[PDB]
C-alpha cells in the first residue's frame, strides 16, 4: 500500500501506452509483494489483485506481475508490450500461464499473469523425488509413474494448443514450466517474439543451464525454429520429467554434444521410463524434422498410456 498503487500523471511518466479496457487492471486494486527469482527478461513479483477473477470479483487473488528494471531500454519496453499483445492473440488454455490483465496507464507497465505456487517443474520434481535419489530438506507429495505420465500428457496438450495458434516456443524446458496449487502444468515464456544479440551456447546462464541441450540440430546450425524443432525440445523435457529434474547430457561439454548428435547418439533411457515412452522420446530426437511426431500425435499417444496405467 505504498507509491506503486499511487497513480502517475501526464508530465512525470516517461512513456504513454494505449489502454484496452477489456485488459486494463486498476493499480489501487494491485498490491506488489515478494519478488519471484532473479534472471530472465525483466522482473517478476508476487502480488494480490482484487477482482482480477470475474468468477469472484470481490475476492483478492495471488498473481505474478512482470515489469521492467529501472535501467531498461526502449527495445525492452517494446519486447514486453509485444509479449503481452501476443498472449491476447494466442488466447487461454489450462496448460499455459495466461494473461489476466495489465496496468498500461498512470505509471510503469505491469503485465499480470496466473501465479504458480509450486514453482518450476525442475524444482517441483526434485523436491518430490523418492528415497534413493539426490534430495535435501513431504512424503504424501512424492511422485508416482502415473503422475509423471499425467505431467507429460498435460504439457503435450499445452504445446498442441500453442502450435494450433501458430505459436513457436523456441525454448521449451522444465525451467520454463510452472506448477499451480492443484498440480496443473502451465508452459511459460511462449509469447516471446524477442530478437537477441550476444548469443553464447558455450557459456552457462545465471543458474548453470545450457539452453543448447534443448535445441534441435536445425535450430543450432541454421537457426530454423518450427513446431518440429519444439517437438525435439519436448523430447528433452520428457527426459527431465522421467529423471525427476535430471540435467540433460550430464557432464558432456558443448563441443562433444554437436559431434555426439551428428554421429546419431541420443540420451539413455531413464530408470522410471518404459520402452514405449523412451521410443516416443527417440522419435522426438529424429535428425530429420519431418520424421518427428506432431503434438496432435503426442497427445493421442500419451492419452492412451494414461488411461492404461490407470
Ligand atoms: C523470470 C524469472 C523466472 O524465471 N522465475 C521462475 C520461477 C519464478 N516465477 N516466474 C514466474 C513467471 C512468469 C511469466 C511472466 C510472463 O509475463 C508476461 C509471461 C509468462 O508466460 C508467457 C510467464 C512465476 C509464476 N507465474 N509463479 C511463480 N513463480 C514464478 C521466477
Task: Characterise this structure.
- This protein folds into two domains: 27-114, Phosphorylase Kinase, domain 1, CATH 3.30.200.20; 121-309, Transferase(Phosphotransferase) domain 1 (Transferase(Phosphotransferase), domain 1, Orthogonal Bundle), CATH 1.10.510.
- With 310 residues, it is an alpha+beta fold.
- The chain has helices at residues 74-90, 121-127, 145-164, 217-221, 227-242, 254-262, 275-284, 295-309; strands at residues 30-35, 43-50, 60-67, 99-103, 110-114, 177-179, 185-187.
- A hairpin with a 5-residue loop joins strand 6 (177-179) and strand 7.
- It has eight helices and seven strands.
- Bound molecules: ligand A1AFR.
- Residues 36-37, 39-40, 44, 64, 66, 83, 97, 111, 113, 115-116, 119-120, 178, 188-191 line the site of the ligand *CCC(=O)N1CC[C@H](n2nc(C#Cc3cc(OC)cc(OC)c3)c3c(N)ncnc32)C1.
- The PDB classes it as transferase/transferase inhibitor.
- The entry lists the keywords TAS-120, TRANSFERASE-Transferase Inhibitor complex.
- The assembly is monomeric.
- The entry is titled "TAS-120 covalent structure with FGFR2".
Query: Shape, please?
Result: globular
Level-1 CATH class name of the largest domain: Mainly Alpha
* Strand line-up across the major sheet: 1-2-3-5-4
The arrangement of helices and strands along the chain is EEEHEEHHEEHHHHH
CATH architecture assignment name of the largest domain: Orthogonal Bundle
How many individual β-strands?
Answer: 7
The distinct bound ligands, ions and cofactors come out as: the ligand *CCC(=O)N1CC[C@H](n2nc(C#Cc3cc(OC)cc(OC)c3)c3c(N)ncnc32)C1
User: Structural class, from secondary structure content?
Assistant: alpha+beta
CATH superfamily of the largest domain: Transferase(Phosphotransferase) domain 1
Strand count, sense and closure of the main sheet?
5 strands, antiparallel
Distance between the termini: 49 Å
What is the total domain count? Answer: 2
Domain Protein kinase: 30-310
Cytoplasmic side: 7-310
Binding site for ATP: 36-44, 66, 114-116, 120
Protein name: Fibroblast growth factor receptor 2
